[PDB]
Design a protein around this ligand. Sequence first.
Ligand SMILES: Cc1cnc(NC(=O)c2cc(Oc3cnc(C(=O)N(C)C)nc3)c3cc(C)oc3c2)cn1
Ligand SMILES: OC[C@H]1O[C@H](O)[C@H](O)[C@@H](O)[C@@H]1O
Ligand code: NA
Length: 448
Amino acid sequence: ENLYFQGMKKEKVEQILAEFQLQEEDLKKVMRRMQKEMDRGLRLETHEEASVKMLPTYVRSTPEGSEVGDFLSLDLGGTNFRVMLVKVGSVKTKHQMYSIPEDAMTGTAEMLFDYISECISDFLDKHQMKHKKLPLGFTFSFPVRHEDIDKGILLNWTKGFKASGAEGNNVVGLLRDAIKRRGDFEMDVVAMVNDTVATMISCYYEDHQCEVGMIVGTGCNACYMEEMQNVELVEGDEGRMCVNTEWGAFGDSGELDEFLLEYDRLVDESSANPGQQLYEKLIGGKYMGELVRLVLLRLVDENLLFHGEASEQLRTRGAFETRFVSQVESDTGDRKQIYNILSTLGLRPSTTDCDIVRRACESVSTRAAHMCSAGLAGVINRMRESRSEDVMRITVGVDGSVYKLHPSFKERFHASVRRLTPSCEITFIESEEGSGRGAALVSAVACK
Ligand SMILES: Cc1cnc(NC(=O)c2cc(Oc3cnc(C(=O)N(C)C)nc3)c3cc(C)oc3c2)cn1
Ligand SMILES: OC[C@H]1O[C@H](O)[C@H](O)[C@@H](O)[C@@H]1O
Ligand code: NA
């Protein structure tokens, strides 16, 4: 054992883990670069080359006038596929979740939308309603270049999605075509929204100060209410329009290069979209645990962890799940939680190994919280400037398992957004069934 040696090991672990550190000045630089990229995406002259697409959603700040009744909501792209029935009068919901097979997410668009329509059919039978033709709102968690609220093309798949015959086509069209092939129900697709947009809308229903939507789950993205005069891609300078930043693609033109560590390159190289969504790759739940797995293999190689031996499970892709990062950080100090996770990964961890794993997890999750904060602060700072407000009071509607379930992420992120947002008063709100509710609320407003 030896207490002096155990300590020397933790000191070398720390020297390696120090590479994850971001100073406040590094965060201001990342923020200013994000802001620079946001200005570029919004302008007609630089939009095509901008990595941050600042996509117009066609969701506008409207005086009001919502329709009443039953609205169907679809949710694709997060954790599984969701069908929701929404009653607007007051808003009450009925919902069901479906596990998307891999063969659908990695086969053809036809297979993907066929499965989606099969699920819709099943939801309608379980609620006895495959006869009623309802207005339908679609949450589609991918970059889309809109023509209108109900018409938009998929730019590219993100988060490991690979279905053929989708990129370059109208997503509402693919959906509508799938429903017709099946022929057992009828729906009127009135709106297609990003998950950030749906979250902002459902959170706004509870707090009218909500004008920013943020996702920190499988992926990482944000939307906000932009001045119509700044939205150059849409003719008009009156009122506001929701803009999907698609900030996951920040760093794709080399904007984050000085901060990319070896673990980031490996995660990217072994990903379904290499060279894409690099900022998201620093924060997202699809990558977080994989980043911890890579750091652990590095420490196994320096003879600082597990007697320098990694098990088959520790050398398995995606084996250190993001939930294990959250769970390792939940550990009360007894090390029981860390121990069980490691035992299940075929390791014989000592108390020191448990502590080192705890440290690698905090280094990765604290970096994610800090990178994410630079992005939110840039959006918020830009809004304060655009609205020419001395002190801007805004509410941010947030969804996702990383922001929601990680034990310290949320706290580290809020404190870092605060340091970077002086003269800003930010309220953070967590969405209760965010996406589904949001897509139907936009549908009720749109259905006039
Ligand atoms: C074509 C088009 C253009 N813009 C929109 N625009 C919209 O649908 C719409 C709905 C909104 O949120 C709402 C949430 N709930 C309710 C509500 O209480 N209902 C009963 C629905 N209303 C609004 C918000 C909030 C912001 C900051 O901008 C919004 C736009 C919709 N369609
Ligand atoms: O799900 C969170 C985010 O993940 C990815 O970055 C998608 O491209 C984006 O559309 C979505 O909002
Ligand atoms: Na405009």
